[PDB]
């Protein structure tokens, strides 16, 4: 059906400090030489309230993509705290990995991210202003939400 199929996503350096870059080791396979590059994005949801707080941590092209099975590490910078609503800073949100071909998204892998203080003192009494230097990010890598879209591969 679709020329590209994602075989697996391994979440590296997890858990880790909120400031560390996201590191995904992706494995996907191409059923037939693509004429263009694949475009991958890592999107962090600052708040579920509005998409207006989505942060595209990074956008990269992968290519060339000859038919076969392939693997690469998609690394991106940690979101900018200054753009994250205080109330959504500590707790759970989501981070998305999407892939698009010829301007059309065909796959999207969402993960829940849990940002908590490891320091029991702070966990008991969280500061009004979230302290991201002391936050730990735990990508819940066991339960990935995979959504596939039907696009025109030409």
């Amino acid at each position: 059906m679709a020329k590209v199929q994602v075989n697996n996503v391994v979440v590296l350096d997890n858990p880790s400090p909120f400031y560390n870059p996201f590191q995904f080791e992706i494995t996907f396979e191409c059923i037939e030489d693509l004429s263009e590059d694949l475009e991958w994005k890592i999107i962090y949801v600052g708040s579920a309230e509005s998409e207006e707080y989505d942060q595209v941590l990074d956008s990269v092209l992968v290519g060339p993509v000859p038919a076969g099975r392939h693997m690469f590490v998609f690394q991106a910078d940690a979101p900018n705290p200054g753009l994250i609503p205080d109330a959504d800073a500590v707790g759970v949100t989501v981070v998305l990995i999407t892939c698009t071909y010829r301007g059309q998204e065909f796959i999207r892998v969402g993960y829940y991210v849990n940002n908590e203080y490891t320091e029991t003192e702070l966990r008991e009494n969280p500061p009004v202003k979230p302290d991201f230097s002391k936050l730990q990010r735990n990508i819940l890598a066991s339960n990935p939400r995979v959504t596939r879209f039907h696009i025109n591969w030409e």
Partner: peptide, 21 residues
Amino acid sequence: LKKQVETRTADGRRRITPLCI
């Protein structure tokens, strides 16, 4: 990996050339 090859597209975009399995 991270012996991974990345270049810039003709128009300055980041591009990773994947490893073949």
